[PDB]
């Protein structure tokens, strides 16, 4: 109970509180689970004054509680106050993970064997997420946790949405995110109607980054982002322009100077040819032509790991997304109180 600043009262069960690396929800500590007798990871949350911090906290919890997969971080426990009135913070306990792809890419050159195995786990976890009818929407290196034995786990589902046809709102681009380098081009061109393919695009960016230790599209803003993308893929074909339904976005693209495609083998001369063929299918401008998670796993680059007899899917896909925008924070704090109930005495 002592981390730079405030009350991190994770009760008697958790002690030996060390300080870890920032996630997105706030202060994160490591600790000893005196019940399961193992070190864990603990995240402190306090989002009740903000409608959106509440939305993200509730999404993350509703989804992670219902997912169970080797390549997806789980929630081991949730610590919160006895009554909805005393509840101001929320501690989410999860498996302690040694590092993440973001840290690793800053210090290590990944052999093709590492790249192959990391990419396979990312997709195996994604296959499960998508089989549940969920879009992660914010895949990036720091959201890919790893242990010392290279076991990988996807985390941070605060921005995830159920692919609910009957409703999907505008304003995702306007959300605060630590980085937009992994966002698919349709996110900057159409106002909504995003599909599972935005997650495959993010994975393609991560694969590219594993191949050279540098982000492939590091724009400094939406306009710059799209320019980096078009600078490598080349100007969209008339056929590609057909997937952009927004009038101003389509006019914006036709006002941009023509650009040729830069061959993948020119950007990544030392990369495995099969990895590049797969990269090309993931970083396809047109969302409909982009490779699907299941076809991706079946790609030749991942042949030594593909095994559909050992790649779990959700038994029951979520069919509806939650009306959390038209809901005042008080009703969110409320729902957050109900969802965390299963962990109270």
């Amino acid at each position: 109970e002592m981390v730079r600043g405030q009350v991190f009262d994770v009760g008697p069960r958790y002690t030996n509180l060390s300080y870890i690396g920032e996630g997105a929800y706030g202060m994160v500590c490591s600790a000893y689970d005196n019940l399961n007798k193992v070190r864990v990871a603990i995240k402190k949350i306090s989002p009740f004054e903000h409608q959106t911090y509440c939305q993200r906290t509730l999404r993350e919890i509703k989804i992670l509680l219902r997912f169970r997969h080797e390549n997806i971080i789980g929630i081991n426990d949730i610590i919160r106050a006895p009554t909805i009135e005393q509840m101001k913070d929320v501690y989410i306990v999860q498996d302690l993970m040694e590092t993440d792809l973001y840290k690793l890419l800053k210090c290590q050159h990944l052999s093709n064997d590492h790249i192959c195995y990391f990419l396979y786990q990312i997709l195996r976890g994604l296959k499960y997420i998508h089989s549940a009818n969920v879009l992660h929407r914010d895949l990036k290196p720091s959201n890919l946790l790893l242990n010392t034995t290279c076991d990988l786990k996807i985390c941070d589902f605060g921005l995830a949405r159920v692919a609910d046809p009957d409703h999907d709102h505008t304003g995702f681009l306007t959300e605060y995110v630590a980085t937009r380098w992994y966002r698919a081009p349709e996110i900057m061109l159409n106002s909504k109607g995003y599909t599972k393919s935005i997650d495959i695009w993010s994975v393609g960016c991560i694969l590219a980054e594993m191949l050279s230790n540098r982000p492939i599209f590091p724009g400094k803003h939406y306009l710059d982002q799209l320019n980096h993308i078009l600078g490598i893929l080349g100007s969209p074909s008339q056929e590609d322009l057909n997937c952009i339904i927004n009038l101003k976005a389509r006019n914006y693209l036709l006002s941009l100077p023509h650009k040729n495609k830069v061959p993948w083998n020119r950007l990544f001369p030392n990369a495995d040819s099969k990895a590049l063929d797969l990269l090309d299918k993931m970083l396809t401008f047109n969302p409909h032509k982009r490779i699907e998670v299941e076809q991706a796993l079946a790609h030749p680059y991942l042949e030594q790991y593909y095994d559909p007899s050992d790649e779990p899917i959700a038994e029951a896909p979520f069919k509806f997304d939650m009306e959390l925008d038209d809901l005042p924070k008080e009703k969110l704090k409320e729902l957050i109180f109900e969802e965390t109930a299963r962990f109270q005495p």
């Binding site: 840290k103 690793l104 210090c107 290590q108 195995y117 790893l146 290279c150 076991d151």
Partner: peptide, 16 residues
């Protein structure tokens, strides 16, 4: 380890 399960012996190490 998922990797052993797949029959991969390559000792994949991390430096950080």
């Amino acid at each position: 380890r998922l990797q052993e399960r797949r029959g991969s012996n390559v000792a994949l190490m991390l430096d950080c």
